Amino acid sequence: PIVQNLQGQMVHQCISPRTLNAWVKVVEEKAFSPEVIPMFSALSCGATPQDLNTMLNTVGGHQAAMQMLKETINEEAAEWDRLHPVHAGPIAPGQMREPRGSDIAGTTSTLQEQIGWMTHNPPIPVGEIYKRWIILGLNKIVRMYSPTSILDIRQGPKEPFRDYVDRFYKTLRAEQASAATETLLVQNANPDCKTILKALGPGATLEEMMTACQ
Amino acid sequence: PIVQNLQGQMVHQCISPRTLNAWVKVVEEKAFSPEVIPMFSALSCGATPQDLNTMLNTVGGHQAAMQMLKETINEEAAEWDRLHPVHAGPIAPGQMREPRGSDIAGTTSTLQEQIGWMTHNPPIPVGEIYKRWIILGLNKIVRMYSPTSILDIRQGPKEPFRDYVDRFYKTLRAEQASQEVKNAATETLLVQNANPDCKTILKALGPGATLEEMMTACQ
Amino acid sequence: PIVQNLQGQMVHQCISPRTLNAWVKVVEEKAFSPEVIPMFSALSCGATPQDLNTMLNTVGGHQAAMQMLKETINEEAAEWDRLHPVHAGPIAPGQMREPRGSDIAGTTSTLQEQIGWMTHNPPIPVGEIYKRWIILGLNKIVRMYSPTSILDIRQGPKEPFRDYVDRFYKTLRAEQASAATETLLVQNANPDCKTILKALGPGATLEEMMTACQ
Amino acid sequence: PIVQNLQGQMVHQCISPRTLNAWVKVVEEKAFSPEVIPMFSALSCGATPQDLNTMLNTVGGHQAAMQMLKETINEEAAEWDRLHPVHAGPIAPGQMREPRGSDIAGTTSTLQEQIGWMTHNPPIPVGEIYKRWIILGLNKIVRMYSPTSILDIRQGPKEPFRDYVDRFYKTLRAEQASQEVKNAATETLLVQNANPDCKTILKALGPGATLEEMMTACQ
Amino acid sequence: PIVQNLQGQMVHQCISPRTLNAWVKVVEEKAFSPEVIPMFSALSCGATPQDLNTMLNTVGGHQAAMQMLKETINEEAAEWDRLHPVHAGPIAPGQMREPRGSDIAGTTSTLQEQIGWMTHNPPIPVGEIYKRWIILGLNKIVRMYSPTSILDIRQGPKEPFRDYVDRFYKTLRAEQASQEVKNAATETLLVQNANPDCKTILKALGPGATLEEMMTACQ
Amino acid sequence: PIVQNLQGQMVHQCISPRTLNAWVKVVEEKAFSPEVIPMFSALSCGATPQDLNTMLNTVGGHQAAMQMLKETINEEAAEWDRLHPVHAGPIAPGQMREPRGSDIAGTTSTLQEQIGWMTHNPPIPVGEIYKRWIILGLNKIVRMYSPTSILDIRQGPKEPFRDYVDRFYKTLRAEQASAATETLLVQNANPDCKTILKALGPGATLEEMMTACQ
Ligand SMILES: C[C@@H]1CN(c2ccc3c(=O)n(-c4ccc(Cl)c5c(NS(C)(=O)=O)nn(C)c45)c([C@H](Cc4cc(F)cc(F)c4)NC(=O)Cn4nc(C(F)F)c5c4C(F)(F)[C@@H]4C[C@H]54)nc3c2)C[C@H](C)O1
Ligand SMILES: C[C@@H]1CN(c2ccc3c(=O)n(-c4ccc(Cl)c5c(NS(C)(=O)=O)nn(C)c45)c([C@H](Cc4cc(F)cc(F)c4)NC(=O)Cn4nc(C(F)F)c5c4C(F)(F)[C@@H]4C[C@H]54)nc3c2)C[C@H](C)O1
Ligand SMILES: C[C@@H]1CN(c2ccc3c(=O)n(-c4ccc(Cl)c5c(NS(C)(=O)=O)nn(C)c45)c([C@H](Cc4cc(F)cc(F)c4)NC(=O)Cn4nc(C(F)F)c5c4C(F)(F)[C@@H]4C[C@H]54)nc3c2)C[C@H](C)O1
Ligand SMILES: C[C@@H]1CN(c2ccc3c(=O)n(-c4ccc(Cl)c5c(NS(C)(=O)=O)nn(C)c45)c([C@H](Cc4cc(F)cc(F)c4)NC(=O)Cn4nc(C(F)F)c5c4C(F)(F)[C@@H]4C[C@H]54)nc3c2)C[C@H](C)O1
Ligand SMILES: C[C@@H]1CN(c2ccc3c(=O)n(-c4ccc(Cl)c5c(NS(C)(=O)=O)nn(C)c45)c([C@H](Cc4cc(F)cc(F)c4)NC(=O)Cn4nc(C(F)F)c5c4C(F)(F)[C@@H]4C[C@H]54)nc3c2)C[C@H](C)O1
Ligand SMILES: C[C@@H]1CN(c2ccc3c(=O)n(-c4ccc(Cl)c5c(NS(C)(=O)=O)nn(C)c45)c([C@H](Cc4cc(F)cc(F)c4)NC(=O)Cn4nc(C(F)F)c5c4C(F)(F)[C@@H]4C[C@H]54)nc3c2)C[C@H](C)O1
């Protein structure tokens, strides 16, 4: 990653073994549960495109997801190239070239070039641009890996309301990855709780609803 | 988080994997037992709003509690906006804007804006303001997750007094109430709901006895 | 805590996750065995009152003990207020106020005020004062949690002398938490060892005693 | 490894126990699954040739693979010597010599010589050159350890499409081939070797469908 | 402990949780096997007397050994006071006092006094002096905890020579004796107490054979 | 160890608990498998003779090996003393003395003297000299602990060639610790693989051999 040293300057630092392992293990433990995306984003704080590729290349399995991710990255990179076409020809000696999409993804750029862009004045934040594309792709994967539509999360006749609400927002977390939808919560409650929730009224907070269905 | 460097400057530092994992694991292990709140507050020392959202977003499960937390944050943010309204209309290009409640919550503000506020002179401590809101929400969650009411904690006939007092204060710790209200609950209930053998001993010590004296006398 | 940076100045630092976890785990593993007190004192090196309250608030269970601790703190704080009463009235603009007992305990003081006291020239070491009160209370808890009086640690007829001595000083550790008492060691030995210890003489070292009863 | 200090200088630092253990454990856990290569490259960030040899020498078992690695290194070192021959004959006493391939591999060079090359102005990045050789050797090993050929990955009649695509790209990941060759293999095989029900759905999407569209359609 | 900072000054640093835990765990795992002593000495690198007491006080159990340690410390402290008596009578207010044995042991000295002595110019290394006393006490404890005497280590009839030599030097390592005495024990016992088949082979090598030659010959 | 601080100067640092534990655990897990030697050498980066003695004194068991190591060290130290005899007599006040072999081994030198030698201009690298002697001794131990001669690693009739090659080079690793020997690999292969390897020809790489015997 690129971070600040004790002195105040922006310098490259190796990715730490702790970071590497934490990322591999969260995917081993949780696959593409929604909380894997904020974990990715935090563990890639300050990352270069090289570091982002390292993180993704160390995922064990899930290679269909990783190919979908590559396809998303290539779509965003094409849009980048359409918005920011690069000068064709040899670049001036010693000077910074403009990054294309495959440079942002770390495929056609060197680490030194990535550092140059990310620390230039003004900077071209190629790590953050690439991370945005990766997170867009990972949100698609989350939604796809979600096993159940929110329309089908419905409270069982013996199911505690809190357990139902947990299932509902766990599912909505994934489904929304990539408003009124939350009104399904009352619609999909069981008859005893729905009767209580309807008499409660429509301005009730979730806390009020959960207390009333205790 | 924001930390001091050797030049004396306050600067951004990435949240550590150790911190991230520690928070996820405390919720895995303890759910919303009362000690989760002080652990959250300490693990979020120096946190930006971004970092606070990262910590909450990484909680596994408990999504009903997380939605309740979001509703508490929105309530506090609305009160912030009532107390500290931001003057409407475009502002001078290139200058620092004033944060509204959704800025403090990290929803409508960038990291750079959060750093700018937190290191301004004088600082606008948006991380600490948001943390206060989150802690208010967690207090509500701990009360809701508590499986026992303090009125139902009564000493068993074969129950050691220390075990009863442990249950009593475990339950009271999770209630949401001022210390004045909590300590009044103790004056009203603790001796009253001891078992007959212990209660006769405790009444003889008088209303001035310390807990140490009560526990030693019932050992 | 407040510690020295690489440069030589006293600054506030966040409590580390490692410290937080170590403290919670020693209480989970050992409850109020005597060695928990020196572990507390070392893990709270440099602590502010805020940090000390953090450490205590993260203890799982043992809430009767924690209430006893609060009562001890309030007694010491009252004694503080009796010895160091604070000026009544508004304090001069920009100047340091005097801490009362509830300020030392972190209840009515801010972190910034705690830092100010602890780094002032001369300092008011409110972290160390509060830690003394906490350790006084924890020593009371240790003694109370001790299951057996030292008078009742008596060597069994088949019990190796070393195992007995281990039980004796384990118990004395807790009982003394808050001289001649150690002469109980010979008094409470079994007949075969007592016969050997008495013939050894009264100046014997523990090593000499243990060797002789091997 | 070589790292920057506060005076801005590049200086040697000892390899950490955490790094050493992380590498030994990834080989223990994953053997030569493809992700071992990116993990090796990241854990050897800033490595000298000495450090690279330390990492390889600490691998437990897999000594046939390690001997194959040494043979690849010797092949690359010979090509280095053909492209960049070192002028024969004694050189000026006290001056920096030019590295030959066995110097880059850490066999005939001292640590001090490696530091000298890596921090020279301009640098001779012998750690990065050796690492490239090692990665070429590991690519060969991963292909050899792969238990399946991409031609034998065919969807089972009861196999979820996502599980089949996972197997397909797990296998393709281990093959040693340009991305052009690998993606041609996909165009030639992935739909062709789907099971009848999935294949009829995929053919109807057309050759332009994305993998997301294919996987969603076969769910 | 006392450590160097960037300004070149020796300054106090808090004992780390990692150090604390490492020491408690080595005693949990190994009790007073001989390697506990070098581990104690290394983990107490730079320690003040306060830190040394912290380490000892955190040992779980083994309180007979801990009391023996205190008695050894008091013996050494008394010898310190005989060799380096502190002039009696009040001293100049505000100046550094001289440490007596109980000051070195951390009992009658403050942390500030310990820092003052250890960083004085010239230093009075009270941490190192106390550590020497503790190590003398631990040497006694290791000898006492050893379950075997070197006279009772004799090779079994089916016992590999290497296993016998391992037992022999494990036992000798725990004895409390100069290296001269220990190596004389080896010359007197090791070959003598080998089993008949090994003993005939070892006698033929002669009294000049190395242990490597003895072990290779009896393999 | 002696290492560089953030500022660029060579200073003594305590051995870390992590290093201490890693070394003890690799010997617990692997005894004297060949990879223990490169692990030792890396974990002792920058070590003083004191630190090297610490590392060896913390090995659990294997005390016959450790005595063999001491005997190797004493042989190398005697050779040192023969090559670099020290001045007999009192050394000049305030000046550096010359190390003898037992000084290099940490037996008759203080830590301060070790630091002085290792940081002098020019330096006497007593840590590295001692480490060389230790590694010479550890290589002897590896070879001795190896259970099987390379002459006796022979492929079974049903044994996969890769598994045989693994056994062969695992054994050669240890045997060589302290060229044509690798031609035993074809000699010691089973009849089916030997037939294939001989028809392959004599210039084949190991990769070619392993592929052909798949
Ligand atoms: C000498 C150094 C070079 N070091 C480099 C250098 C550059 C790149 C580098 O640039 N990228 C890189 C980034 C972004 C794009 Cl879009 C491309 C790209 N686009 S393309 C021409 O259309 O295929 N090609 N590459 C190479 C891209 C990649 C990507 C990263 C990735 C992106 C993703 F989204 C999902 C991920 F898991 C990983 N890794 C792969 O691709 C690996 N892989 N291989 C196959 C094929 F066998 F089936 C498959 C993958 C897979 F992605 F895992 C997925 C299952 C399918 N690694 C690299 C590694 C590695 C080191 C060990 O030594
Ligand atoms: C590109 C970056 C951007 N990165 C950002 C940026 C900004 C915000 C960011 O600002 N916030 C944020 C903070 C505070 C407020 Cl009040 C709001 C808000 N108020 S609102 C319009 O009324 O819905 N909206 N958001 C987005 C808010 C949040 C909150 C945080 C949270 C607050 C809480 F209290 C409890 C928590 F566990 C987590 N996370 C969510 O909301 C996720 N979530 N989704 C649903 C729904 F799908 F089912 C549910 C949650 C849930 F909260 F967990 C709860 C179960 C219900 N994350 C963010 C992430 C993520 C990263 C991977 O990539
Ligand atoms: C916004 C911030 C504010 N952050 C603060 C700020 C201030 C204080 C802060 O000042 N203190 C604090 C310090 C010292 C004193 Cl004496 C008092 C005090 N004296 S009093 C008016 O007589 O009750 N009141 N308080 C609040 C005191 C405390 C004490 C500490 C403690 C002292 C003890 F000795 C034993 C401990 F385990 C913990 N924690 C509690 O009290 C918690 N608690 N609650 C009950 C009640 F439900 F049953 C019980 C406890 C219990 F102690 F555990 C025990 C079982 C009984 N935490 C605080 C937390 C928390 C953070 C998450 O967000
Ligand atoms: C005093 C110090 C010196 N410290 C040094 C110094 C220099 C080198 C050093 O330079 N290299 C080094 C690097 C690159 C090349 Cl190509 C050569 C080379 N080419 S060659 C003349 O053709 O054999 N020889 N060496 C020594 C090379 C090596 C290589 C590294 C390696 C490369 C690889 F690719 C795969 C690996 F796992 C490890 N380690 C080995 O070789 C060990 N080994 N031994 C045998 C044989 F016994 F059975 C086998 C191995 C094996 F490789 F594991 C494989 C199973 C076969 N270690 C070194 C160690 C060790 C320390 C403890 O103390
Ligand atoms: C306010 C702070 C003050 N903090 C201090 C301050 C000072 C000292 C401090 O100075 N020392 C200290 C150092 C050296 C000497 Cl020789 C003495 C001494 N000599 S004496 C007058 O003859 O008894 N007295 N003390 C207090 C000494 C000790 C010693 C250390 C020790 C030395 C040993 F060798 C073996 C050890 F395991 C530990 N710890 C004990 O003694 C505890 N203990 N108690 C008993 C008895 F109850 F059963 C027993 C022990 C025992 F030692 F474990 C052993 C089983 C017998 N701790 C201290 C703690 C503790 C913190 C939580 O809060
Ligand atoms: C006050 C400080 C002093 N601190 C010191 C200071 C100095 C030295 C110090 O100098 N060395 C030291 C270094 C090198 C040499 Cl060659 C000698 C030496 N040569 S000799 C006169 O011929 O015996 N004597 N010593 C003391 C030497 C040693 C060696 C190291 C070692 C070298 C080896 F190769 C293999 C190892 F495992 C360890 N440790 C031992 O010897 C321990 N030991 N004891 C016996 C005996 F009981 F059976 C046996 C060992 C054994 F080695 F393990 C092996 C099983 C046989 N430790 C020391 C510790 C320890 C601390 C806790 O407190």
Side-chain angles (χ1 to χ4, degrees), chain B residues 37-39 41 132 135 139 168-170 172-175 179-180 182-183 186, chain C residues 52-59 62-71 73-74 102 105-108 130 134:
Chain B
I37 305 183
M39 194 59 78
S41 180
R132 179 168 61 248
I135 290 170
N139 285 339
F168 188 93
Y169 280 102
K170 172 179 182 182
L172 192 60
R173 185 85 184 268
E175 303 276 15
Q179 291 291 331
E180 176 185 7
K182 289 190 174 188
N183 294 330
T186 300
Chain C
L52 291 164
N53 284 337
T54 289
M55 291 178 72
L56 299 174
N57 280 327
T58 57
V59 173
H62 303 289
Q63 293 293 280
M66 292 306 98
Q67 180 63 26
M68 275 199 277
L69 191 46
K70 284 180 72 167
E71 293 185 9
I73 293 165
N74 281 329
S102 58
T107 316
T108 54
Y130 192 18
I134 292 161

Side-chain angles (χ1 to χ4, degrees), chain E residues 4 6 16 18-19 22 29-30 34-35 38-39 42-43 45-46 162 165-166 169-170 173 179 183 209-213 215-216 219, chain F residues 5 11-12 14-15 17-18 20 24-25 28 54 57-65 67-68 70-71 75 140 143-145:
Chain E
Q4 284 195 238
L6 294 184
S16 80
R18 189 173 180 87
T19 289
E29 297 162 12
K30 300 294 195 74
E35 63 265 47
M39 194 59 78
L43 291 170
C45 180
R162 180 200 309 170
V165 179
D166 273 350
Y169 280 102
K170 172 179 182 182
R173 185 85 184 268
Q179 291 291 331
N183 294 330
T210 67
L211 185 60
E212 184 185 23
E213 292 163 354
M215 289 181 68
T216 290
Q219 257 180 334
Chain F
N5 57 31
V11 300
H12 181 267
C14 294
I15 186 170
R18 191 176 307 269
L20 288 162
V24 169
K25 290 305 196 181
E28 286 182 6
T54 289
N57 280 327
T58 57
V59 173
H62 303 289
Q63 293 293 280
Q67 180 63 26
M68 275 199 277
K70 284 180 72 167
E71 293 185 9
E75 292 170 343
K140 296 175 170 181
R143 181 179 48 76
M144 177 170 297
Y145 266 52

